[PDB]
Each structure stands twice: as structure tokens, then as C-alpha cells.
Symmetry: D2
Subunit: 266 residues, 4 copies
């Protein structure tokens, strides 16, 4: 007899799960995730902000790195997200349980997070993770100021409907540094043209390349560091090769155009 298949776990390259110590980006901003997944800690005189958590199993590691940075569970005030896929919002439910953190997200990201990434537009139920509730819904261009660090939301729908770039100005050498944490612009295996679950997908991606291109962007970071040419394992040279927002947007668009062409042929 042939039974139905076993459930399949969402497995990822080992590097995405490889713990790293905190890597400083600017005076208040640290990469505290893994070698190949971004989780940004921003430390304020009025508590901390986390942008992304990576995979579900990273919760304790993130907590460890926060502790090394001087941040206790009570000190974590806000979680922001690029997009609510398992490899970026994975540990959010657990972080909410174990810290003081509240989540702010747009409606699309909130709805996807609340269903734990199940019924994904492209990936079905294959990337389900523990669901969490958003505490605050943000609109496009809305600001959240935490201890004078002002975070601005820039919607960049495509990779998910709720995909968001987050921007803020930190310092280095008494000089302002405009950090752009731009979301993914990939469409891996997606049906792009005439997708019934996402009829305006192509229009949304096109608008998003333009949005990303135009961001205040002294330093670009991305959920997958490779997408912006960061190498978190490279120490003092980790960001040396980083793309500009312009170059990231252009590369993503050129890739997308190729994908569209391949789809038409397939």
C-alpha cells in the first residue's frame, strides 16, 4: 500500500543557521543573526528594536546576542519585519513570549504572520511557522520613532504582498549614516504572469524596483546578506563589497526580466 507522504520540514542551507557574534554596522546598529540571515538590533537610550529574526530556531541565539549587547528581554521594545516568511519572521511568536517586544507591521505582513505563513501565495503550506499577532499596523511612509531613532516604512510589494523596506539614520564618526534595510526582490519559482492569487504581481515588482532605487541609502542591508553583497563572516570587510540601493534594484530588475522571458518560453 502507499500511504500519504510524511510532512516535510522547511530545511535551509547550513550557513543560514550558522550562529555569529554581533557585528556592528553603525553606532547603534548590529547584525545579531546568523552568517546568512540578517537580524538587526538597533540600540536606543529608550530600549531596543529588532528588524527580523531569521528562522524559528534562532530565538535563543538572538536572545544570547542581545544579552552580549547589553539588552535584556525587558529592553526589547519593538520587532519590525522585512516580510513574514519563515526564514525572516520565524522566531517572532517565541520572541514575543520571551521578551517585552511588540510587533509593528503592515496589514499584509500582519495577516500572513497571523496565519504563520500558511496558505502562502506561491509556497502553499510548505513554509508554515508559529503564528504571531501584530500589535500595531503601519501604513506606507509611516514612522516609528524609538529613542530618537526614526524608522520609516517603504512598501515594496512583490516577494510578498507585505514586503517592506525600513530606513533610519544612525551615526558613524559624528556623521549621519542613512541605513536602508531593503526587503527581498526575488520571485523564486513564482508564476509571474496571470497569477490568479496575485494578478498585479508584475506591476508591483516594477514599482518596488523604483522604490528601492530611490531609498535614502548610504548603506544597504538585505534579509539575505548575499543579495546586497554583504559577507557577514568577513569581519572588518563584511560590508566592503555591499551594493548601493540603485545597483540592488537594477540587478533584481534584470533578473526579473530574465525570469519573465523564461516563463513566457516555459
Amino acid at each position: 500500500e502507499v500511504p500519504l507522504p510524511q510532512l516535510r520540514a522547511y530545511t535551509v542551507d547550513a550557513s543560514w543557521l550558522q550562529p555569529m557574534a554581533p557585528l556592528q554596522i553603525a553606532d547603534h546598529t548590529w547584525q545579531i543573526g546568523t552568517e546568512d540571515l540578517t537580524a538587526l538590533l538597533v540600540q536606543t537610550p529608550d530600549g531596543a528594536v529588532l528588524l527580523d529574526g531569521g528562522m524559528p530556531q534562532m530565538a535563543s541565539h538572538l536572545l544570547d546576542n542581545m544579552k552580549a549587547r547589553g539588552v535584556t528581554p525587558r529592553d526589547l521594545r519593538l520587532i519590525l519585519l522585512s516580510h513574514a516568511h519563515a526564514d525572516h519572521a520565524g522566531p517572532v511568536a517565541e520572541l514575543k513570549r520571551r521578551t517585552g517586544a511588540k510587533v509593528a507591521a503592515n496589514a499584509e505582513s500582519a495577516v500572513l504572520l497571523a496565519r504563520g505563513g500558511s496558505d502562502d501565495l506561491h509556497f502553499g503550506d510548505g513554509i508554515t511557522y508559529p503564528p504571531a499577532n501584530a500589535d500595531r499596523i503601519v501604513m506606507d511612509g509611516e514612522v516609528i520613532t524609538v529613542g530618537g531613532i526614526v524608522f520609516t516604512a517603504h512598501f515594496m510589494a512583490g516577494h510578498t504582498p507585505g514586503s517592506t523596506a525600513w530606513t533610519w539614520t544612525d551615526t558613524r564618526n559624528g556623521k549621519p549614516v542613512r541605513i536602508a534595510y531593503a526587503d527581498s526582490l526575488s520571485a523564486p519559482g513564482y508564476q509571474l504572469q496571470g497569477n490568479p492569487r496575485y494578478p498585479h504581481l508584475i506591476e508591483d515588482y516594477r514599482r518596488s524596483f523604483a522604490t528601492v532605487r530611490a531609498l535614502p541609502c548610504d548603506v544597504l542591508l538585505t534579509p539575505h546578506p548575499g543579495a546586497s553583497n554583504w559577507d557577514y563572516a568577513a569581519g572588518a570587510r563584511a560590508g566592503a563589497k555591499a551594493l548601493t540601493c540603485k545597483a540592488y534594484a537594477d540587478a533584481a530588475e534584470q533578473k526579473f526580466d530574465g525570469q519573465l522571458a523564461k516563463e513566457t518560453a516555459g
Copy 2:
């Protein structure tokens, strides 16, 4: 280097995933799940009721069996649950999307279902599944009548806080048959004594053995058919060896007492 572990899928014995054709229990009541997981279809002149769905991957199989029984997606009106673990409520979200079915459950089951079984009192995040919302909250002893089949809820907290027995009266040979679909009474690997997440666990199990013992119970069925000595693969003899509610309750209590003793020693 040592990366964090990959996520682990909730895997189960093959028999739990082995499709079977509909097996009739009484005039209106059919087992439509797998060889080792119960999913009961109750067919009414006013639409159908499903009690449990088994594992997440069983959704399509259940839909196939409903079709064989004369039940289209539109005809499925109500889903009831024993308890909201992945191996019983697994396909509920998908069934809601693909049919007309609404879910009725107690508060505890609703809350656990809404978080997709994540943050389980005993199993942590190991048995997460797609979350779903309950459409109706039921109280202990509350009835839901569907086309003259009256279903009564009997709370039997223990295996989960929201564990419920469902009872209804069907017919065979113009004679009433009082069917008791009693939930699990196991506590696999549970910390029973002084559990901070479930301080009254032992008291709740004791009350539940008494509840199960007293059910109107011409025929007992259970989420795992083996627990009540059903053999779904045995055709005309499938229920021949079935326990009474009294015997099921007594066996569960004797097992529980042994577990309590082993725990004290361990």
C-alpha cells in the same frame, strides 16, 4: 562549525497516513479518515458534519471520501474536534478554504487551533500546523443540532485543556445507537505532577475518566482507533472488539496511575 539544527517535521507511523475507503458505523455515520486516524462524516438531510480531519496532508483524501458519500464541498456545514493537535485538526484550515465548513469548538480548543498548535503545553513548537479560526465557541454540555442529528459536547480536559467528547444518536435497524466519540486520555511524556503550565492536570484527568465512564455509549469511537480497540482495516469486524466507554475510561485511568508512579520514581 556547528549550525543550529534544521527544523524537524512531525512524522507519524505510516498506518496513520494510510488512506481507506468510507467505513459505515451507523445509518448516517462513516469513518472516512485513514487506517489509524479517525475522521467521522455524519450525513444529514440538512448537510454534513465532520468530526476530526486527522493529519494536515489528509485534506484531499477526506474530500475524495466525502464525494464518494454524496457530499460536495458546499454540503459540508460543520467541523467538530476531539482536540486541536496536528494529528486530529491538521487539515482544518485547508478544509475551511475548500468547503463551506465552519468550525465549532470550546475556548481552549479554539485558542490552540488559532495558534496552529504552537506553544503546546507539553510538546512546545514541535507539532505546529496551519492555524484556523473557530466560528462558534461551545460550552460544556452545549448541543449543536444539524438536520436532527443532535451533537452534545462533554468537556474532558487532560490530553489537552480543550479535549472534548462528542455524542449523538444515530440508528441501525430502526433502533437508536448512542455513539460516543471520546477524546484521547493519554498523557505521552507529559509532566503530570507540579506542572507549572498545567497545575490542575491530575484533577482534570481524574474528572475526565469519570466523564468518559458516564457517557451515553452504545458504541465508543476514539481519535486513535486502537485506543478503543477498533480495527478500521478489519471490514465487517472493524468494531467487533471495541471497548465500552467504561472499559476505555478504566484502562486509561490504570495507565495514568502507572505513569504517575513512574514519574514519582523518575
Copy 3:
């Protein structure tokens, strides 16, 4: 002493609460709400669709009109919404409890509906109503076909972030009739310029006037019938004076421009 003020009820002009009998718009489409609030019943060989319900207290009236049309609670399959304010989505929770109806809405409308219209961007908590959950999230341009009546979503953010026009093709005289149920385009008392809760409000309204202008639109209907020059109390002449989508959009834009000017002056 001065106590805090009593809670204030959301009160409305009497005409918004004045029951009317079903008024036919096309072969399958009926106005079944009140004299001054639209609630559209669309009747299909495969069940019925309701677009809007009006105020919370209209639930029973709507049920009465459905019954007069041949539609039992079981027959109501789908609820669609213009926007999730109390005067349009008011009875949705109750309708879900009392019928087979499931709700399909965009993420913004779902989030606002789920909080019962509380924490409104402009109206605070003044228009709270019973919350309800969406069963299906729709994307811009997505279709929902019910018994061959195909409903297309057209996002028209402004009045609320989740404001939606719904379009479908019915018949009259063996001729197709393209019905456009366009949402409100008002901004009553709203802060339009530099609104921190809605930074791109003006851009969204401008885009929405263009969206409405371009709809397939043999017949325009609106949540407040007066907005499209319908007079539901006028019998055979109820729609005689109805605006085109073009004229509705233009009037709304001219009004909006005046409001923007008044705001700058104020």
C-alpha cells in the same frame, strides 16, 4: 464633581435605518438594505452573495429580505465588502453566526473588520462594531466566481486603506449589464495633508479617482446611494438619475480638491 463622559453611540440619519423591500437592479441583483444604505444580494444557481450589510442593527432585516427572495441562511455563501466601517460591515459578525456565509476581503479590510472598526485612522474608537474574521484574503484584481457570476476586486484606497470596488456582469433583456459597486470616495473631517497615520492619503485618493473612472460600468451603485444619485425610495425610477462611474469619480475629485484647499486655509 465631573465624571468622565458616558460612551456615545454611533447614531445615523433615520433614512439609513429605514427598512425597504427588495429592489431589483438586474436579473440576479437586488438592493435589500435600507432606503439610504446599500446591501446588494446577488442570486446564483450556486448560492447567494451579499455585498455589504449596512448598520449592525440591520441583520434581521437583511435575513427577512433574503427569505422573500428565496434565500435561506444556508444559501448565503459569500459576503463581500466595500469598506469595513460600521455603517457598511456593521452586521457581518451576526450574519456569519446566523448563516452559512464566509467573508472575503483584502488585508486592510480584514484587519479593520477583525478589530471591529476600533482604532480607526480618522474616527478613533467612535464607530466600533462587533468584530468578525475574514475567511479569504483577496488581492487587487482577484476574481471570485460564484455560480458563474464573476466578481472582480478593484482596490480604491482612501476612504479606508482597504476600500474596494466590486464589479460583475449581470443581465437585463438578454443583454449584459456591467455593474460597478464603487466604494465611498469621501473624506469626512479627515486630515488629508501630512497625516501621520496615513502619509500617502492624497496619492491614494488620486489613484482611486482614476480607478473608479476606468471601471466597467454600465450601472454604478455606491454604499450610500445618494453618492451615485440613486433614490431607492423612487421605485421604477430608483436608478434613473444614477451617475456614471466617470461622473462619480469627477465629482469626488472636485470635492476632494475643495477640501484640500479648505484644509490649507484652516
Copy 4:
């Protein structure tokens, strides 16, 4: 013509809305609500806890009193609830938005809070308020320790399914003071016998009188101070006349027995 009735606001005696300054109960515990609604602030070296908020319109007043006590919005860590009716959990949604506070409640209270008290077992939709999500679900007898103040949940179902007494030990004069914040035990206008929405109502009330009777209870407080003979307007004598838990339970039971008799006659 006769339109449907306007929505009716939930109005209350003026005294329930009469602001008062903080009134100290024990070293760490203050009444910060109104003259006739309890809202208890418990202040810890590790942040503050609020038990109840009273009516929806009390949010700002509570925030004012917290400020007078040395408690900023960031310092408020936890909200606990007696039961999730509008006159006790009314401002919870707003408090969550305006402070760092997370909510811990049992499943029943969470479900009722999440629907903003709509579809109440006895009161229909008449007492709807802004909905809020619970951050943590508590079981009967579960403890939540905040800065060494240990709060224990004691379920006392009846007034609502999720009705809870909260107990903790504070100090006065270097002596322990066991504070019992016991929920309401009233059943105003309720159908007690054979209520289809609450079939075991009488059994639950009986169990709850016994639970309340047995609480660790040097000092009893109740959501409506009059129920335990507190007079918050009486300064140094505010609690002089307070009932014991035993006397509160007995009075509630005697009242309940009278109600049951009146119901049988009616």
C-alpha cells in the same frame, strides 16, 4: 414609517466614571480607577502590573494615575483581568497601544476579549467594546511572578465563563498581606436554569462560591467595590467595612439561591 432603532450606548452610573486619585491598599498595591470601578496597580522593582481597567473611557485617567505613582507607559508590563466585560476590560486595547503592557488571561477571557465582548452569553451585543488580543494564556492555578510579586489565578466561572480571582501577597508593617481580588459573582438578568448557551451555569456558580470561600484572603477586593463593601471615597476608612472572602461568597450564594427561586416562579 418606523426605522430600525438607533444603536444604544452602554451607559453606567456616574460614580463608575468618577475619577479618583490613587488609594493605597498595601505597600505595592493601589486602587487607581474610579470611585465605583476597581483598577489595581501593583508596583514592582521590575515593572508594574494592572488588574482591570474599568470602562473604555478610563484609559487616559489610568495613565494619569500611573504617572502620579511613578509609572510611565514603558513601565507597565502586565494587564490581568477579573472578567472581559466592558466595565472591567473596557480600555485594554487602548492601554496596549499606549503602553508596554501585555495581557495574560485564561482561554475564555481571551476569546471574549478578542471579540470585544460581542456575542455575550447573556447580554448579546449590547456591551461591545474595542477588542484586544491576549499575549499569554493562563491555566487554573498558574502563577505569574513579576518582580517577586507572585500572582495566582483561581478560575471562578459563572458571571462569565472566564471569570478569575487573582491572589498575591503584599506587605504592610513588615507583615504579609494576602490580597484576594475576587471576580463578580452576580448573575444580573441571567437565565440560570436550562440556559442553552451555558448548560452547566448553576454547577459553575456553586463551585465558584466554594473557590472564593477558600481563597487566601487577608484583604478582599472586587471589580465593583460595593460587592465587597469597599468605599473608595472614604479615605482612611475605605476598606474598614470590607467583607471577608467567606462573607462575600456566602452573600453571593444566598442571593443566587433567591434568584434561582424567583426564576422558577417567573
